[PDB]
Every structure is written in structure tokens, then in C-alpha cells.
Amino acid sequence: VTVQDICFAFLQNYYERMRTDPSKLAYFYASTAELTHTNYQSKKDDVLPTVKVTGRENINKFFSRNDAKVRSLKLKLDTIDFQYTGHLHKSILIMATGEMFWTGTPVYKFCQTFILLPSSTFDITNDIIRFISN
Amino acid sequence: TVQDICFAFLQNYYERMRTDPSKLAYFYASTAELTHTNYQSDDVLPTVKVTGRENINKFFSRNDAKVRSLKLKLDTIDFQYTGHLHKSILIMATGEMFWTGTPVYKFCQTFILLPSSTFDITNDIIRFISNSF
């Protein structure tokens, strides 16, 4: 299995898990993971604000509170970039860009970056999304 | 603060690029990975992967004149801690980049900084973003 293979599978699996069950998303994160995500709780704009959440239990509470919204997330994935990083060059840095929307909303351009730390499997240690004005 | 470290890093990174491309590589770890504008090759540009400080220096040095002409509007910064003991810093920047006399290109760029008081860049990826329309 190639690094490109695992990055493509990772991203596809991550976004589809949002559709299928937001309450189990946190399982794929390290216990001490950092998330910077779409602030669904916040109060036209072609960007959205984000919020920082740290630790798997908090990440779970965040996704779970926003279950209905998270289930409705959709995207066009345009680009993927990766490099190895971290201890013994065994972790993986991934950057994705595309256009994200939710059922019935306009699109928002985004870039999202992840760091995957190996256990056969990987845990997400970092996950940052940034919306970009067109 | 971490926000201060990130802002200082970004300013210094792009400014050292203006002042001396042949010294840029020393801000990178010996085994760093770079994915940068492929100067050796539309509102996007191709990028190239370069590995290790020696090859990163060869890259910046061969492209010295072009590298010196790089300019940007920095719109956004995001950061998190990462890596061993949560001591490394993951940074994402977005903005609009150009070079003397060129049109702008929308970009996102990510860095990871590993503690050396100082930090070495272990990872640096740029991606250009094409317009929605």
C-alpha cells in the first residue's frame, strides 16, 4: 500500500464518516488530538468561522452536539498534497482543498490539513480547516 | 505566545527569501520535505517535491532571482501544536502570492516547525487555489 493510497483512503473515509455517524468521528483521533473546525455554534459571507477543540472527549462532544449539521456535509475534493513528518518520518502530513457545502447551502472554498500518527492504523493528531474567500 | 512565534516565523521566512535565497535552506531540518512552486516548469502553478537540506538549497539557489521577486498578501494564519511531546508547531497560511510584474495566485501553505530556543522547518507545502468561477 502506497502513501498516496493511504491519503486518498483516509480523506474519503473521514468525510463519509461525517455522513454516516458524527458520534463516532472522535474514535479516529488520538486521545490528545487538536481540532480546528467549522464553528457550527456561531450566530453574504463566503467564509465561515472556526473553533478550537482539544482532546478526544471534547472533540466527540463537539461533533455529537452538531450531529444533524455534520451529517449534511458535502464537498468537492479538488487537491491532495502529502509529506512524511514527525518521529522517524512515519507520520503523514496531508493537505486537502476543495469546495464544501451542506444540504441546501452555497459552497465555501476550504483548505484542510491533517497529521496522521501511526499506531497498521493511523490516528489523527491534528485537523485544521480554513475557509478561503473566493 | 504561539501566535507570536507563528507570525514572526512567517514574516522572517518570506523576508529572508527576498534578501538571500541561498541561506533559506538553513531554516530547514536536515531531512526536511519541501513542496514548492516549480520554477522549472491559469490561476494556479505546478509544484515540485524536494527532500533534504542540501537539495532544498540547490532548489532555492538555482532559482535565486525568481525567489527574490516573491511577494504576498498574507490573509490568514491557523496553528496547532503537534509531534513529539506536543512541542512542534503546525501552521497554515493563506493569501495571494505573486512575483514582480505577475498576476496574483491564491494559495494555502502549511509548515511544521520542530524545536532545534529555535525551530527547524521539517515540512513546507504550498498549494495554489483556482477560482470557483
Binding site: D46, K74, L77, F101, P106, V107 | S132
Partner: peptide
Amino acid sequence: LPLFINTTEAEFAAASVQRYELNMK
């Protein structure tokens, strides 16, 4: 790539024009 995830090209196209329409509002 591009990959449509949790959606179709047609649904995406609708969201895209929605954005343009708001941009021009």
C-alpha cells in the same frame, strides 16, 4: 480528482450557483 463526497456533481453545481447568486445580491 475532483471527487464528489457525500454528494453528486449536480447537487454541487446547485450549491455553486447559489454562491454566485448571493455574491451578486
